[model samples]
Target: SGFYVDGNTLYDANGQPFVMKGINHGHAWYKDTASTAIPAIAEQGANTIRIVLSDGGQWEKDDIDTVREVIELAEQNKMVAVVEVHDATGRDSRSDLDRAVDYWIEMKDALIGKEDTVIINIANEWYGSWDGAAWADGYIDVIPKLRDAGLTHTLMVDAAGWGQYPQSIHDYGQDVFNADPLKNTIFSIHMYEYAGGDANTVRSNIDRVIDQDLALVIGEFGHRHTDVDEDTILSYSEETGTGWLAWSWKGNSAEWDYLDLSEDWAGNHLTDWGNRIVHGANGLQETSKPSTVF
Candidate 1:
């Protein structure tokens, strides 16, 4: 929770501007080896770690303490944790909406008072070509239930259709705009390699949302190609004071080879060309006119 912007600036607890420089790691259920990944991410100068709670990856009530353990690990290391729920079964229809809500409620219950360092991302990427109406409708029911149940931590919700465009949130505006202005809610979006948008196009698209007085965050980006440069996005974020979380940290497969995590999964060698371009300081620094790697 607590991932939103006000007046074009993402804010921290004291309402001061904040910029999230982070890496995405899939669920501990997907790979509890986060114990290994966290340290490496921190070593890369990341101040935050984004994680997904995928299907069959959520922590049940009894596992609340374990959830707290991970949150404390982040806090102890001076990093914030972006907790995300990634379920798509109910995205297109209400078939699994109740189950999704139950999952959110359970997670929220386990994390009721953790706003200082933890944030709850509502869902990974809802699907709908034109608008996020369907997704918002589900949240309209889900969010209130959590609030009424006394789980008042901050929450983040992404736009539908893998959170591609701001246009997807058009219908959710004004209709169910919570009267509470500071309930810790953020609108999340994602831009990927195959989105078919150049840097200028991406900025233009984001500008449209910025004009709406709604807070926005790029939850996931960067995979497959260097079509969109992170530095350019970071520079824009620096100017606008928005926040972002790159797609991944350590996976050696095609769907996640962005990082140079070795085949043995021991540790990412910063000396490797791939790691040097991304994990190196100065944001893709050049020893010999450093090649850009998105």
Candidate 2:
């Protein structure tokens, strides 16, 4: 019912190393064929995809089979999946905790043996209303229930306050890195254009968490077209040996779509910067002069 970490990296039962390169799956935009997105994401060298479970499964009428189908699609296509129980309010209330647990318990049953490629993220952001203490308290309670249910797979836990801030081992009233440090226990944070912290700033924050010997992951980030340097962020994560998942893959509206301004994938597929980073083939590759784009 406890967890541990090793040498600033996350490991499995046999102490194998793991890092996530994930993409958020925008379900509302995919309609009934959301399953199709999984294959495309895998083709893009993505190993993980995050999905939000909405309406307590009201859309699927609480029928778990539909959710299982999605997970199966990801598995069949060789993609890891992280299921998030998303809620915008009531994070600190007991009822909300029960609701969140209930949601994942059902999902856990459907995905019991898929530990090789699936993770359950208890909640997204949990908003800023809840403090770190409250989050620790909730996770301290919830994590055990999951363990008792035979869900020994990887589980993601995030800090409070929009989930962008990383909680120190001391902030939570105990050393998370030392207390039950399980290889599957991933400490997550979010980032964005207005995150109040930049690349260097976030790197320092991560250094603090990793200094505690805890594994780090970025659960969310910008989805705005103007901020379309997803690969740059990926590069930083690679350099730091941290794992991350971008805010989203594909959404229809500007408010949600980070890659697309409209339904077209022409300009939206990959920005100029994204293309260069993904290609990583040709460049000036010298120190003589600055490269120009035409």
Candidate 3:
């Protein structure tokens, strides 16, 4: 067992609580980059990395072979792998969500034995609207299907409204967790300018999950979004003992370049965002602990 959940807290195999202070690697777009990025992330003291994958719809499809390679890279670097599908990113329909489930089914073999180190994030912000029922019902139907397909790894589901809406998580997180036969589901919410850009909003959003005793993580957050306050998110996660992964390791365009953690892919150049998130007070480097299984 690499990482498991017990009453809203994620624990390493050795029974120590594991807080995932790390960054996301947009592997779907920057394929073949993890070979260097994974190790660099580890060097910065991140305990985990959330990797993006596409199902041949919105972006290039990452086949089972590629997924296995990604997992292997993470293990080699001694980091937990949080793999997610980006195909359903902004889809609001049930069928699109189903396609995401089907993608997992297709990649089942690749994920079967990696439970100890891999977390299956079914879809990355699958729903676009604020329909709580659609979000809950979609996962309610697919979670059992995933279990039926033998994906016993801890499942992580992103919140609806493009991962910005915390109310959806507060409303149906328990239902989604219970829907899983193993009861090992975790909820994720992305804090963007529109969702939680202010200090009070970020604290309130996280507090909603904490008060409900739900396992939650800031699956994605950025430092330079229009009004997003990355400092507040970082500090609050530290105070509350919540797991968080910054928006990305690299691969941002000119307009949003600030979101990239590393100015260069080799991690030799850490941008201001990277410095704040990885070396600032209560940042990832200061708080992350490698999984004991490593």
Candidate 4:
């Protein structure tokens, strides 16, 4: 009865359809700096939280023990944890994808038994190229490697092209899903300026995925992106019963501060984007329902 995909819907362990209305927590850089962030996010009524991790590349590697603590923290806070590797943010090479898979292999022990609560996001935007073939081929190869390595948790794959392009997801989503031996793979698209910055683009991108009868999620989105219409994305997600997770929960630098949900690491201050996504119409607090398993 753990989290599993049935067609295009994600069912919780109790068989309830759990739409992931939550925010991304940047743990790779901040680590435990915001130890209270998980419960604070839950206080906003988020049903899920996508935690960012590193493989010792650009940022410090989040070791297995630390990841276990993160997962436990989410459990204590009654939130679903979607753990992902951030090392492949803008890389297009196959080795980058391999490194991501290898990182999972190394952490198999920590992820094996957390199927009901944890989702392994294979990598965060593993490719930078628009080559749909590379995106398709990469996951097609890595899914089995994970299964062979004994990690049976739901595996989440981010869309290629910096996670902004939907063409690859449209063309190869089914192929990637089929490639998973467990049939538990789900695709995620990061809606940025180019992907879903406007209402028309957001609707069309989401429609394409729904039409395919494939399970999908707005893995990351921002209210203040170049041209992103967070309102449209949120409203559409609610109407269509699709799941979404906002870009982040604070700790952003000066240039990207607008993306931060909180004014500080303590989660005491909610930014404008934070207030909108959590308190506004069709927002997380208004729509989120905790997974029945919890």
Q: Against the true structure, whose TM-score is highest? A: 4
True lDDT of residue 241, candidate 1: 50
**255, model 1: CA deviation in Å?**
3.9
Model 3's lDDT to the true fold?
0.87
Q: After superposition, which runs of candidate 2 have C-alpha atoms over 4 Å from their true positions?
A: 1-7, 12-15, 28-31, 55-62, 88-90, 168-170, 173-183, 194-196, 223-232, 259-268, 271-294
lDDT of 3 by residue, 69-164 (tens): 998989899989999998888889888788889999999999988888899999999899998878999999999999999888989999999999
Q: Write the per-residue lDDT of candidate 4 for residues 102-167, one digit (tens) a residue.
A: 999999888887889998899999888888888899999999999999888888888888888888
The C-alpha local distance difference test score for the whole of candidate 1 amounts to 0.57
* Predicted structure 1, TM vs. truth: 0.79
Model 3 has a clash total of 0
Candidate 4 structure, TM-score to reference? 0.97
- Give the per-residue lDDT digits (tens) of candidate 2, residues 33-58: 56556666555555566776653523
Better of 2 and 3 by lDDT: 3
- Poorest 10 consecutive residues of model 2 by lDDT? 285-294
| Candidate 3, position 251, lDDT | 93
TM-score, structure 3 vs. true: 0.96
TM-score of every candidate: 0.79, 0.78, 0.96, 0.97
Q: What are the clashing pairs of model 1?
A: 1-119, 1-120, 1-154, 1-155, 126-161, 132-168
- Using TM-score as the measure, name the better of candidate 3 and candidate 4: 4
Could you report the Cα RMSD, in angstroms, for every candidate shown? 5.8, 7.2, 1.3, 1.2
